[PDB]
């Protein structure tokens, strides 16, 4: 979603998003996945939002 | 083997248009000479 | 940079002319980009090449003016001979003719009028001439046509501007004739509202006239 | 092992291994096998998972329940190849799949015949020339159908309430 | 007193930015939208966002329902 | 559409050979040569054949309709095939977007004719205001 | 006389104030006038505020069951609204502006208010029931106005709605065709829970010279390129959900009229059946005529451009 | 006289419509304020970047006749700028407007007024008791003449043009449309022919023109125009735009289909007619 749909970039951040099972994901990829399904697809944990970044 | 693509079908609707147009003129006309009456007007006095 | 060619050509065919006139001619038949050859032909010394005993060049930047790639090839033995981009260049010109008249040229056609024989070097002609922004359309290969949605012109014998005249008095005459029909409608509209509010104000009447008597 | 077969059976492209598996996982011995399977099953490369599939056997399926579950992991892959081909030629040869696919053209018209009844294909199959015929939905229509219903329903609709009225 | 003073401001910008955008979530969709709709990602703190929703439901707009979240009062 | 003969001059460029170590994906340039005749045969033709459009490629028509497939899978390039013909329809547009276009083009091109009349020649516009007083 | 909508009578205005006939009739508003210059500016705002929500307020005034419209103006919103409402500084520049207009002699007060729905339809949120039911309690005679700039480019036409809430616990009549929207799934719940706390006027025009001169300007101006293919009707969307709720109502008629049979001496049952389908009726017609008027424009200037000679 | 001679545009002036609409109502509302269409003075803000001038906005001004002379409230316009900036603040002062017909000895007084409180303002005159097909709207400029030794402030006309946004063509298309077609179905295609009409007129004005060029063309002017002669050859040859099968289909395709819609049209009116009559029917004669 932001090599393939933004074209201008720019003010742009696109972090890491790290959770309570300490599974990590882009940002941009995880908060979208959250639209529909909630649930972390990696588990059945709800995914706590502990850090972003690195 | 019709597709209704032909000036033919066009034709008819427009002859079904003016039947169409004729019968409303003649219900409106009717719909008025109803309106004419006596009984309907003391109603709405 | 075709046309600051042309007009460079124009500027020296104004002096020096003859063999040199005629191989700068030439060098115009070959030089890609030249898509025009009025402005040429109205220059005087070309009229000093027709009094001139050469006129096998004068000939062959005549048909380049006027005529077409079926011609020149009737013309083999009055004409010089051309070069590759001198006869890709007829052939762009030629289509320009085709593409002029008919919109959608068959596959048939071009094979026809262009003695064209393998079908992969007709692509490559088409396609060159699109690229070098001569005609714009579309290729239709299961239909095998040709769609050309614009293309340039050419230049007249000042015999074609009596059919221009004729088509944009047609064309005035046409719009004059959609402009009353509007003007018709409008006006049967507005006799349509006039019978309407000519109804309303008779049930108006009838109405008021009815109370009256009660 | 586990963990990855079920997660390949979700149909997920989701990866197993990401920070939970650590790291090292990956290239064991014993599990580069399944790394394998998982790289072509996202991947696509049916030939490949194959050709994985029969060179391991001895710790592919050897896990009886895997066994069981190979059949089921093999059509799920051969329709996900199937699914991401059948849109770009649209109106093929069915032979030319089986070649593909490196099957039988009968379980290829069985696999067809399977994803339409999962309307995963919007189209149908000819038997009698061995073609798979897909419409096109360019034709921009089920509105018409809705108008068509809307005109007939409140047209009869009037004659009723006409004939009561009446 | 520093991180005390540390986490004042930072609840305080939390609370500012999610009542601007204002739209009504499941349990999981906005609080994650309102994140990428700020300036600078990673101030927010997730970890205040849910407790003071959390702590809105004593009163109305928003009173989020503690069981099923779903009741969040659009209205105000 | 690109050739073979300007291959010869970017490989050399590229890295000796190609950029990166190698290609061997029938070279990264040819790759891209076909990728991009076929998006320069997308721009005119509105459908093609298999061995006409393997001509057009250098390529032979199994390799054409392959490569042709993956585009369109990929979103790259929007069209559709028939393997029974062997014809791959590009892009049509329809009937009214292709009218509308030429319609546009033709009313452009009509008010470019008319600035290019009023500014080279200004006397013509001061004959167009005497004529549309006289009537 | 086209300009005779213009002339602001004080006294009358007063009058009418001071008599009340809404307090009579919670339906007694049922048209919205609103003037070229107010549906220009409003619209504009609107598609300046982009994909966020802008709102004004209105200037008009009343004339029996009609409420009209003349003008408009932004308040300033420092930090987009960053305090409670979209007013901030509000009445600041709105008195200033109001003064400022008693001079200049613009005297038409406010009559409502406009908001924007950028992509979602024109109807009344929770939030926009509760401001709009407020405003029905201070200012009486005020109109929830609503805009949406992106359908305004979708459909080709500006959406536009004009609303007027019930007083709490008040319930409607069964009378209410209710035209169908497409709602996306972020709204749908609460448009669905406030949908019937409120009802939709009928909004007209009634030409002018403000009309006059600004249409057939900016319409030469731009519609040299008078095509625009001929139908942008053609986008099911629109015609499909009106022939759909079209389709409802008729049906909700029949089955009302059906059970109505039944019971012999109910008058108003007739009345509403009556009205419902003659409502139906006008609808579809308008549908038509519009229809018609694009094929008509399609066919002329079709035949003209392709085979005039 | 006040209009300077030989003088060109030296900006370029951008016009919305906003600006013409508060133009039109300022004039009515004075007008039917006090009977005589009364001559309204207001202010231009916008946008300007160097030479381009974009005037996007307009508002009304206080004027006080006194001493037969019009005097600015400066102070209002002044305390009408802040109002302004607090709602927007990319928008800049950029000139005044008036109504009337050619610039009277009242403009100048009026315009020297705005010339002291900014740079350069611009002068904008509409004419709303016009009679021609133009448009009644000039931008005229500040120009510095020396006139019998005496510097003489005058006024030159600007070539300006017409700026529209994609939302504001939009909103007045559909203000065309709105009257177009009556609330009440009230002159349905009067407009919408008249609309066509005049697109047409257009077109033939464009089409006598190129045809008196060529007929001047034939008889002096340049014997060969070259680009332009050629590309109205080519441009006729698109004048039958020329068609085939399926192109025809198609449009008879669309033709039906609004006809049967047409149809549909028509029998819900005849059965809504048919409905009135039947529950007139009901009542006249028979019971229950
Ligand atoms: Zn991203
Ligand atoms: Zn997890
Ligand atoms: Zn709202």
């Known amino acids: 979603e932001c090599q393939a749909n933004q074209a201008s970039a720019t003010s742009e951040e696109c972090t890491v998003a790290w959770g309570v099972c300490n599974h990590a994901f882009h940002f941009h990829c995880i908060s979208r996945w959250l639209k529909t399904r909630q649930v972390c697809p990696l588990d059945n944990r709800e995914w706590e939002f502990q850090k972003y970044g690195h | 083997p019709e597709k209704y693509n032909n000036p033919a079908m066009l034709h008819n609707i427009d002859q079904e248009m003016l039947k169409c147009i004729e019968l409303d003129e003649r219900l409106k006309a009717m719909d008025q000479e109803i309106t004419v009456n006596p009984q309907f007007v003391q109603k709405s006095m | ?214 | 092992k586990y963990l990855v077969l079920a997660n390949m059976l979700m149909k997920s492209g989701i990866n197993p291994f990401d920070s939970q598996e650590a790291k090292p996982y990956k290239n064991d011995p014993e599990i580069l096998a399944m790394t394998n399977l998982v790289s072509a099953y996202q991947n696509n490369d049916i030939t490949e998972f194959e050709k994985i599939l029969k060179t391991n056997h001895s710790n592919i399926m050897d896990d009886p329940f895997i066994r069981e579950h190979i059949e089921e992991l093999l059509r799920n892959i051969r329709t996900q190849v199937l699914i991401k081909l059948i849109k770009p030629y649209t109106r093929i040869h069915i032979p030319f799949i089986s070649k593909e696919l490196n099957i039988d053209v009968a379980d290829v018209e069985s696999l067809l015949v399977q994803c339409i009844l999962d309307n995963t294909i919007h189209g149908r199959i000819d038997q009698v020339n061995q073609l798979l015929e897909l419409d096109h939905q360019k034709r921009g229509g089920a509105r018409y159908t809705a108008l068509d219903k809307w005109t007939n329903q409140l047209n009869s609709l009037n004659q009723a309430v006409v004939s009561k009225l009446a | 007193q520093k991180v005390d003073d540390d986490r004042k401001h930072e609840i305080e910008a939390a609370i500012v930015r999610i009542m601007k955008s204002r739209k009504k979530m499941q349990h999981n969709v906005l609080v994650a939208e309102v994140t990428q709709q700020l300036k600078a990602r990673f101030l927010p703190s997730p970890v205040v966002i849910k407790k003071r929703i959390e702590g809105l439901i004593e009163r109305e707009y928003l009173a989020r329902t503690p069981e099923d979240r779903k009741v969040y009062t659009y209205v105000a | 559409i690109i050739r073979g003969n300007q291959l010869q001059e970017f490989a050399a460029m590229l890295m000796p050979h190609q950029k990166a170590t190698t290609a061997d994906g029938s070279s990264i340039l040819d790759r891209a040569v076909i990728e991009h005749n076929l998006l320069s045969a997308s721009k005119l033709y509105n459908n093609i054949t298999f061995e006409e459009l393997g001509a057009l490629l250098e390529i032979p028509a199994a390799k054409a309709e392959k490569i042709a497939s993956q585009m369109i899978t990929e979103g790259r390039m929007n069209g559709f095939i028939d393997q029974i013909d062997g014809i791959v329809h590009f892009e049509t547009r329809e009937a009214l977007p292709t009218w509308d276009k030429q319609i546009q083009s033709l009313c452009f091109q009509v008010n470019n004719l008319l600035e290019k009349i009023s500014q080279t020649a200004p006397e013509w516009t001061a004959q167009a205001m005497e004529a549309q007083m006289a009537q | 006389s086209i300009d005779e909508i213009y002339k602001y009578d004080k006294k009358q205005q007063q009058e009418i104030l001071a008599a009340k006939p809404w307090t009579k009739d919670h339906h007694y508003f049922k048209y919205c006038k609103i003037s070229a210059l107010a549906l220009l500016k409003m619209v504009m705002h609107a598609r300046s505020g982009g994909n966020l929500e802008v709102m004004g307020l209105m200037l008009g005034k009343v004339d029996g069951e009609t409420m009209i419209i003349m003008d408009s103006f932004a308040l300033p919103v420092e930090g987009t609204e960053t305090r409670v409402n979209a007013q901030a500084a509000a009445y600041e520049y709105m008195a200033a502006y109001i003064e400022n207009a008693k001079q200049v002699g613009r005297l038409e007060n406010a009559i409502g208010w406009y908001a924007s729905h950028p992509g979602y339809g024109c109807w009344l949120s929770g939030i926009d029931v509760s401001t709009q039911m407020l405003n029905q309690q201070f200012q009486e005679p005020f109109v929830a106005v609503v805009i949406d700039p992106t359908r305004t480019i979708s459909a080709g036409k500006v959406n536009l709605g004009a609303f007027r809430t019930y007083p709490k616990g008040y319930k409607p009549p069964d009378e209410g065709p209710s035209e169908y929207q497409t709602i996306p799934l972020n709204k749908i719940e609460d448009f669905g829970v406030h949908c019937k706390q409120y009802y939709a006027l009928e909004v007209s025009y009634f030409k002018s010279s403000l009309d006059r001169k600004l249409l057939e300007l900016l319409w030469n101006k731009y519609w040299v390129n008078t095509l625009s293919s001929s139908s942008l009707l053609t986008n099911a969307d629109y015609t499909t959900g009106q022939v759909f709720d079209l389709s409802e109502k008729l049906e909700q008629s029949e089955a009302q009229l059906g059970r109505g049979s039944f019971m012999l001496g109910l008058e108003t049952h007739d009345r509403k059946s009556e009205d419902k389908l003659a409502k139906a009726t006008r609808d579809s017609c308008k549908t038509t005529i519009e229809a018609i008027h694009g094929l008509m424009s399609q066919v002329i200037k079709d035949k003209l451009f392709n085979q005039i000679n | 006289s006040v209009m300077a001679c030989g003088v060109t545009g030296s900006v370029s002036v951008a016009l919305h419509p906003l600006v013409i609409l508060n133009i039109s109502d300022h004039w009515i509302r004075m007008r039917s304020q006090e009977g005589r269409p009364v001559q309204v003075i207001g202010a231009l803000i916008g946008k300007q970047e160097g030479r381009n001038i974009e005037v996007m906005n307009s508002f009304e001004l206080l004027s006080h006749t006194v001493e037969e002379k019009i005097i600015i409230d400066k102070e209002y316009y002044y305390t009408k700028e802040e109002q302004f900036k607090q709602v927007f603040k990319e928008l800049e002062f950029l000139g005044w407007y008036t109504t009337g017909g050619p610039p009277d000895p009242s403009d100048i007084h009026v315009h020297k007024q705005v010339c002291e409180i900014i740079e350069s303002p611009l002068f904008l005159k509409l004419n709303p008791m016009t009679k021609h097909t133009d448009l009644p709207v000039s931008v005229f400029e500040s120009v510095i003449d020396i006139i019998n030794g005496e510097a003489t402030m005058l006024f030159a006309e600007l070539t300006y043009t017409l700026a529209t946004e994609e939302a504001e063509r939009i909103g007045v298309d559909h203000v065309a449309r709105m009257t177009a077609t009556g609330s009440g179905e009230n002159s349905t295609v009067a407009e919408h022919l008249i609309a066509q009409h005049s697109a047409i007129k257009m077109l033939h004005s464009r089409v006598k023109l190129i045809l008196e060029y060529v007929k001047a063309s034939e008889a002096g002017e340049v014997p060969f125009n070259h680009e332009i002669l050629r590309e109205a050859y080519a441009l006729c040859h698109c004048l039958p735009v020329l068609s085939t099968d399926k192109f025809k289909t198609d449009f008879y395709d669309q033709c039906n289909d609004v006809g049967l819609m047409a149809y549909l049209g028509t029998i819900t009116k005849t059965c809504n007619t048919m409905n009135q009559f039947v529950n007139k029917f009901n009542v006249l004669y028979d019971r229950q």
């Open chain 3, 1 to 214: 940079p075709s046309s600051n060619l042309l007009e460079q050509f124009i500027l020296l065919a104004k002096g020096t002319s003859g063999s040199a006139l005629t191989a700068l001619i030439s060098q115009v038949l070959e030089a890609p980009g030249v898509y025009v050859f009025g402005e040429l032909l109205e220059l005087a010394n070309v009229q000093e090449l027709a009094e001139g005993a050469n006129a096998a060049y004068l000939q062959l930047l005549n048909l380049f003016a006027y005529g077409t790639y079926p011609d020149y090839i009737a013309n083999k033995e009055s004409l010089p001979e051309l070069s590759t981009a001198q006869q890709n260049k007829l052939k762009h010109l030629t289509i320009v003719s085709l593409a002029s008249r008919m919109k959608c040229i068959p596959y048939s056609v071009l094979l026809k009028d262009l003695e064209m024989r393998n079908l992969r070097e007709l692509e490559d002609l088409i396609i060159e001439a699109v690229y070098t922004d001569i005609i714009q359309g579309k290729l239709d290969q299961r239909n095998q046509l040709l769609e050309v949605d614009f293309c340039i012109g050419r230049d007249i014998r000042k015999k074609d501007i009596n059919n221009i005249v004729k088509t944009l008095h047609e064309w005035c005459d046409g719009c004059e004739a959609v402009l009353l029909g509007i003007e018709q409608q409008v006006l049967r509209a507005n006799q349509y509202k006039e019978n309407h509010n000519r109804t309303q104000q008779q049930v108006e009447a009838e109405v008021t006239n009815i109370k009256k008597t009660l």
